[PDB]
Amino acid sequence: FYFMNQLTYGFLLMITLLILFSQFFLPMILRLYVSRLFISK
Amino acid sequence: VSTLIPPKVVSSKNIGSAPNAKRIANVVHFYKSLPQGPAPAIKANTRLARYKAKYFDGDNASGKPLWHFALGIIAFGYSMEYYFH
Amino acid sequence: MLKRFPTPILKVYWPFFVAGAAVYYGMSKAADLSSNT
Amino acid sequence: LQSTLDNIQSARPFDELTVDDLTKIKPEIDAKVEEMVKKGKWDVPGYKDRFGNLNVM
Amino acid sequence: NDESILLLTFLGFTGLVAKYLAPAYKDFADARMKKVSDVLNASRNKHVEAVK
């Protein structure tokens, strides 16, 4: 049926979203956490 | 038998042990420190910076942008709702 | 502002990626078979 | 230390410090962050001691 | 219509959300805003008192 438009595309989407998240956004939260820890310590 | 000399031996080690580590940690960040909001960069224009400043700023931080996005997606989807059914 | 930090994407998350590849391959194989059209 | 107090009196961005400025000032925090990222130990020992969670859980 | 009544009820849902959930989330966020600012200023005060 009409399956070769959203499943493999969706897999590419969640792969790139996982990459972007883990490489960009989590590091900002980690950086703010460690900065608050450092200037608090 | 003689007089040993303590009171001028602080040259080799600064007084205190625990705050010595914090001295270098807290003395270095004061040089490149913003006096009062230096370089705020509150003004920008890249066809989307105005929207970020007006709505996506921390001053308001309300749910209005989400409702505006919902209204926009409804307006966009009305046309293809007519097209399909 | 925005910087790239190299967290492990394959050293630790390989099973999920290989499972996704296998699922995609199975879907492609069964598209001409498990469709009944 | 008079220079330190004089700077701290009117150059203390408590609510307006840039994280990029913090990273540029001290590369040691950057080194620590990449080292712990590549090590896989995402924990930062001693982080819930002073910072709350407001956890709905 | 088959879908317009949903559009009519969306406004009421948004109104109730803003009436009930929005003030609660606003207070919850601002409480930790003040908490973080105060604890950060207190840590800085402790550090400057130690250096003094």
Side-chain angles (χ1 to χ4, degrees), chain A, chain B residues 1-22 24-35 37-41 44 47-85, chain C, chain D residues 1-5 7 9-57, chain E residues 1-45 47-52:
Chain A
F1 313 111
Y2 204 78
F3 274 69
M4 182 255 308
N5 203 180
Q6 53 267 69
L7 209 47
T8 176
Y9 191 58
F11 275 115
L12 265 298
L13 283 150
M14 32 71 49
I15 281 158
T16 186
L17 190 87
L18 163 65
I19 292 168
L20 260 56
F21 262 107
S22 181
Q23 305 286 101
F24 290 174
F25 302 136
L26 305 186
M28 332 281 190
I29 312 301
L30 176 76
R31 177 73 61 191
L32 72 92
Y33 279 166
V34 300
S35 67
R36 199 182 288 110
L37 189 142
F38 175 81
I39 66 141
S40 294
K41 81 189 275 189
Chain B
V1 67
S2 177
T3 168
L4 46 85
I5 177 153
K8 46 181 89 164
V9 306
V10 305
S11 41
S12 174
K13 299 286 202 224
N14 176 276
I15 63 168
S17 293
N20 280 347
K22 191 45 67 198
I24 188 74
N26 67 8
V27 76
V28 300
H29 64 227
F30 282 134
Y31 300 101
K32 278 80 68 180
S33 58
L34 270 55
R47 156 205 78 151
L48 268 80
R50 41 94 188 168
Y51 192 87
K52 301 190 288 181
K54 294 295 188 293
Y55 288 167
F56 289 167
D57 56 314
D59 199 2
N60 290 314
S62 295
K64 292 190 288 295
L66 184 62
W67 307 332
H68 281 286
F69 184 68
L71 185 60
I73 199 157
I74 290 157
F76 172 51
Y78 211 65
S79 79
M80 91 195 87
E81 172 62 33
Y82 275 160
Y83 299 152
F84 282 169
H85 189 195
Chain C
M1 174 46 237
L2 174 45
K3 278 141 189 152
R4 149 48 188 278
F5 308 85
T7 88
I9 61 171
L10 193 138
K11 207 171 86 175
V12 54
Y13 309 143
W14 64 272
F16 313 117
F17 187 39
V18 73
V23 163
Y24 157 70
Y25 201 66
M27 171 205 158
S28 191
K29 287 186 80 70
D32 206 9
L33 203 69
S34 85
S35 65
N36 205 356
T37 47
Chain D
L1 49 64
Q2 343 316 333
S3 51
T4 306
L5 49 96
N7 221 352
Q9 275 263 10
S10 68
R12 196 185 78 248
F14 66 100
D15 58 352
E16 60 195 1
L17 192 138
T18 314
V19 296
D20 301 303
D21 195 1
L22 190 142
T23 57
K24 164 202 61 53
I25 287 160
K26 177 174 277 292
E28 190 279 331
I29 194 72
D30 293 330
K32 267 286 192 293
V33 160
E34 335 315 316
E35 291 288 328
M36 61 66 58
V37 152
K38 92 170 195 275
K39 275 187 176 68
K41 301 286 107 175
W42 289 86
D43 53 350
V44 191
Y47 62 103
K48 302 298 206 101
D49 48 358
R50 297 185 296 273
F51 317 139
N53 52 359
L54 50 75
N55 190 358
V56 301
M57 291 95 67
Chain E
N1 204 1
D2 202 11
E3 206 166 3
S4 86
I5 307 157
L6 180 47
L7 188 136
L8 194 142
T9 55
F10 202 53
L11 296 172
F13 185 56
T14 51
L16 275 201
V17 159
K19 181 179 174 67
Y20 280 178
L21 282 86
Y25 205 69
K26 275 148 194 58
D27 298 334
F28 283 20
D30 222 356
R32 195 178 178 193
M33 281 325 317
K34 268 93 77 177
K35 190 190 297 185
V36 163
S37 183
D38 290 330
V39 69
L40 211 70
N41 210 355
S43 70
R44 195 80 136 161
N45 182 349
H47 298 119
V48 300
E49 286 296 328
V51 79
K52 281 156 71 166

